[PDB]
Design a protein around this ligand. Sequence first.
Ligand SMILES: CC[C@H]1ON(C(=O)OC(C)C)[C@H]2CN(CCC(C)C)C(=O)[C@H](CCSC)N2C1=O
Length: 80
Amino acid sequence: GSSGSSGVHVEDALTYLDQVKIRFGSDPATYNGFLEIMKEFKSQSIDTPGVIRRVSQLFHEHPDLIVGFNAFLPSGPSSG
Ligand SMILES: CC[C@H]1ON(C(=O)OC(C)C)[C@H]2CN(CCC(C)C)C(=O)[C@H](CCSC)N2C1=O
């Protein structure tokens, strides 16, 4: 039919995390850069709009990853 899976978990952070490794299994350079950008966020050097800017330049050939991440974010307009 179609490649779709509805119903995510409370913490889908680990899901997309490993997905990048499976997608770019033959391209370690792309995955390495992904980790570097994550480090900047871990150091609080960049914010939400900041990390997005980097992703938009790294995964320029894969907009799906950046777009899907918008919904793959637990923290949002939810009650909390
Ligand atoms: C969802 C899996 C995975 O995807 N992440 C990610 O950056 O995807 C983009 C590169 C497309 C990383 C980076 N961010 C960004 C935060 C910003 C405030 C939007 C995340 O929130 C946490 C990492 C920090 S919390 C552990 N994270 C994930 O959970």
